[PDB]
Amino acid sequence: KAKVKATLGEFDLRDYRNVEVLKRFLSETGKILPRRRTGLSAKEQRILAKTIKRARILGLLPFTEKLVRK
Amino acid sequence: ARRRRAEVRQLQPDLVYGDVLVTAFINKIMRDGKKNLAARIFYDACKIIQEKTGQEPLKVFKQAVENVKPRMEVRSRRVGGANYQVPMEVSPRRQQSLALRWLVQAANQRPERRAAVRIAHELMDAAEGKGGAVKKKEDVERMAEANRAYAHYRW
Amino acid sequence: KRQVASGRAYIHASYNNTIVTITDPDGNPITWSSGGVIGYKGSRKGTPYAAQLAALDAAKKAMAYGMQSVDVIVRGTGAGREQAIRALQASGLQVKSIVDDTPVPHNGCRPKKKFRKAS
RNA sequence: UGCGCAGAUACCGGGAGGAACGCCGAUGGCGAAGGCAGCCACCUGGUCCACCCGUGACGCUGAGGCGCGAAAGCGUGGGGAGCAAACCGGAUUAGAUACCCGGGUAGUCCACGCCCUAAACGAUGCGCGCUAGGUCUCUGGGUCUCCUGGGGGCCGAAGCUAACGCGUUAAGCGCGCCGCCUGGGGAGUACGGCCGCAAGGCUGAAACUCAAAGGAAUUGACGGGGGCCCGCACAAGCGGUGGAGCAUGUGGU
Ligand SMILES: [Mg+2]
Ligand SMILES: [Mg+2]
Ligand SMILES: [Mg+2]
Ligand SMILES: [Mg+2]
């Protein structure tokens, strides 16, 4: 399938507000997706984990969700 | 039987009704290798299902057998801590044998003083569905089912 | 005693006992069952059969209140698990949705020495 | 054992409190070591690169000294959710002062002050110069197929090594400085000195005794190690011995 960067166009991944983008880097359990799936570089992947965690504290992205249909 | 899965030793058909399943039965009745007396007995027994019922012996035989085949049974299983009677289905060859084994045994347990009668009654009483064979059939089926809890190993 | 039309079945699986409880759409318990609550007692309450039985039995008690449909919520791993789900599904009592929801700390209290054999 | 009809378990709401931060997470990164993991801010250390601008050998090592030094431990004062030496019980066992289960104090956490040890491990002191490559990777820079640094891994030229291995992250070839060894047991014990509130730490022998103690590899044998095979080995069967009387052989008397 796709890497989550292969999807988007250009974006500021220091931007802890843009939930419309940042929301795509989470699993269905709202867990930060691994590099192998994000398609990101070690360095970007570092920066993102940060931005994602900042969003979570503002209330805009989730810490967790629950698996639907198991 | 490590190497091959063994050919099911085939049987000559019966020289009367022409059925493998009959000789099979005859063989079980046989004692010290005396097949003659063995055969006389089973036929003379089919005669006591004329004299007694309007039906054809073969049909009674078939239909009694079909009545003493188990569907389930507990095969034993060791695991490091206890012993587990695990219910699995019964492959049709085993059914065949248990039934025919059981009949003869059930039959030789009966009271009447003569080979061909014991065979006969049993055969009748079990095609009705009330054999002492059929006891040690519903027991096995029951013994599984009571151990239905452990029926999730079945290897 | 009210008629509820639909609500929640909560399955709590463990390696020692499966337990199932049924509630109204705000999570208030209507009825419930467990391995022990059927006959099994000691190490049999875990077996997927025990799970199935309990599960089915709880559903029957809820169907008394006329319960027709449920959202399932499953929690924990253990033998009875898919079997208690398979049960509710096949109890008539209609299965709207399923959802695992097992608790997990984001690294919380020190686990008992049995559970850090992964030391 | 325990807990539960003084209503537990499972479920929904609310609150209180302590400890640790899931996914990201790596074969990753930083640090001299010990060690460092949610997120934000402030205060602060080390390090790498590019430009080739400044000083002009200002360097290397480093006995002693000082400082840091996981865990456990100690003192005073807090705190205490989960876990847990000791301990109190349930089991298991020939016994079971254990492994398994239920509880549980010190302790684990915070403040300040002590202790100063470790498989404190890369079991490899620090620095510099020299000696093929290939491959993966972190972080820079350029003219960005790749090139040039700095770090992290594997493979391996030459060479080295008892071997196994090491092999531009040397265990190679060489210079400088430090620290350490000199058969095993007695023994990191004794005495002595120093340090510590203690526990104890550092330094550290002899008599006596042994012809060994060791390292790496080899062929076997073995494993309540792994993989794959076979045999009336087990399973599936059929008939038996074990019980009786007698025959025969043996034990013993
Ligand atoms: Mg401590
Ligand atoms: Mg203290
Ligand atoms: Mg304990
Ligand atoms: Mg010592």
Side-chain angles (χ1 to χ4, degrees):
Chain A
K1 211 191 78 214
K3 316 274 209 232
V4 183
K5 143 200 166 81
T7 305
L8 280 89
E10 95 146 21
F11 59 109
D12 183 15
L13 70 172
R14 197 98 72 177
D15 186 21
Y16 55 77
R17 298 196 271 159
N18 177 349
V19 299
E20 315 93 272
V21 165
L22 283 151
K23 169 165 71 77
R24 219 169 277 191
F25 290 111
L26 304 176
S27 82
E28 24 306 307
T29 358
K31 293 185 166 225
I32 300 173
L33 280 168
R35 280 188 55 201
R36 181 255 311 176
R37 278 277 294 108
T38 35
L40 269 72
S41 99
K43 191 188 191 181
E44 290 162 339
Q45 183 74 8
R46 274 203 305 289
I47 295 154
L48 175 96
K50 224 76 153 180
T51 48
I52 300 191
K53 281 162 223 202
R54 288 179 153 192
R56 278 163 182 186
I57 293 157
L58 264 19
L60 325 168
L61 287 163
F63 291 83
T64 5
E65 241 86 64
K66 66 286 138 222
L67 193 51
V68 174
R69 100 195 180 271
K70 194 177 207 175
Chain B
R2 274 202 206 284
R3 300 200 184 263
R4 209 70 133 278
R5 205 203 290 195
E7 353 88 5
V8 201
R9 184 182 289 279
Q10 226 83 316
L11 296 168
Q12 219 95 111
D14 175 27
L15 323 186
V16 162
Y17 302 82
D19 180 6
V20 290
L21 180 57
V22 163
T23 337
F25 184 66
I26 313 229
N27 286 303
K28 288 283 201 192
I29 302 150
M30 161 157 40
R31 292 253 218 280
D32 298 331
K34 308 155 75 87
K35 190 183 171 82
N36 199 25
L37 132 79
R40 288 179 170 289
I41 293 168
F42 178 56
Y43 293 126
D44 312 325
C46 306
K47 289 227 264 62
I48 341 289
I49 344 280
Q50 292 313 19
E51 265 171 312
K52 287 285 126 55
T53 97
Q55 297 293 5
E56 218 289 297
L58 202 81
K59 294 199 73 153
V60 184
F61 174 80
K62 259 63 161 70
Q63 222 292 303
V65 168
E66 195 73 11
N67 272 352
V68 212
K69 295 190 172 192
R71 283 97 228 201
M72 288 282 191
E73 66 164 335
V74 277
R75 293 217 81 163
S76 164
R77 182 69 270 235
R78 261 256 77 203
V79 207
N83 270 312
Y84 289 145
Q85 288 317 307
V86 176
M88 15 205 277
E89 289 168 338
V90 177
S91 75
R93 151 83 32 268
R94 214 193 138 63
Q95 266 157 320
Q96 156 86 1
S97 327
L98 291 150
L100 299 167
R101 176 178 309 127
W102 290 338
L103 266 351
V104 190
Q105 272 172 27
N108 267 284
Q109 273 285 103
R110 276 184 162 264
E112 30 268 312
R113 326 230 257 213
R114 283 169 69 270
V117 190
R118 291 196 301 269
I119 292 289
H121 280 35
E122 191 56 29
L123 262 161
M124 273 137 55
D125 262 318
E128 289 187 320
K130 61 145 68 93
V134 185
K135 278 264 175 293
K136 51 177 146 213
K137 179 272 222 142
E138 271 142 2
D139 305 343
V140 182
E141 287 183 325
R142 271 203 235 111
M143 191 94 318
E145 258 281 322
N147 295 292
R148 182 102 128 73
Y150 311 120
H152 74 306
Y153 312 133
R154 326 163 320 277
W155 69 318
Chain C
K1 203 66 173 162
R2 171 168 42 122
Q3 316 282 70
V4 281
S6 45
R8 272 98 87 108
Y10 283 126
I11 299 177
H12 176 286
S14 79
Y15 279 106
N16 253 342
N17 204 339
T18 312
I19 95 114
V20 208
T21 115
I22 310 166
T23 77
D24 66 3
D26 283 358
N28 305 290
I30 300 289
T31 59
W32 68 272
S33 213
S34 94
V37 150
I38 333 311
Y40 302 127
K41 170 250 200 181
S43 36
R44 256 125 44 198
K45 316 197 294 256
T47 358
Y49 196 48
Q52 184 202 314
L53 294 181
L56 293 185
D57 146 301
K60 180 237 260 58
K61 297 167 163 167
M63 286 181 281
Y65 292 48
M67 179 99 55
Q68 280 161 305
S69 57
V70 277
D71 290 312
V72 184
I73 287 141
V74 40
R75 271 215 262 277
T77 55
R81 241 305 292 269
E82 251 62 44
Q83 255 302 74
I85 316 203
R86 255 108 67 170
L88 301 193
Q89 278 180 305
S91 59
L93 174 49
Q94 184 228 162
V95 161
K96 278 144 56 49
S97 66
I98 312 205
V99 144
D100 188 283
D101 191 58
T102 311
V104 20
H106 302 357
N107 268 219
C109 300
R110 181 177 237 214
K112 347 171 86 275
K113 174 266 200 73
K114 159 219 304 215
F115 288 123
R116 339 137 74 257
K117 278 352 278 291
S119 316

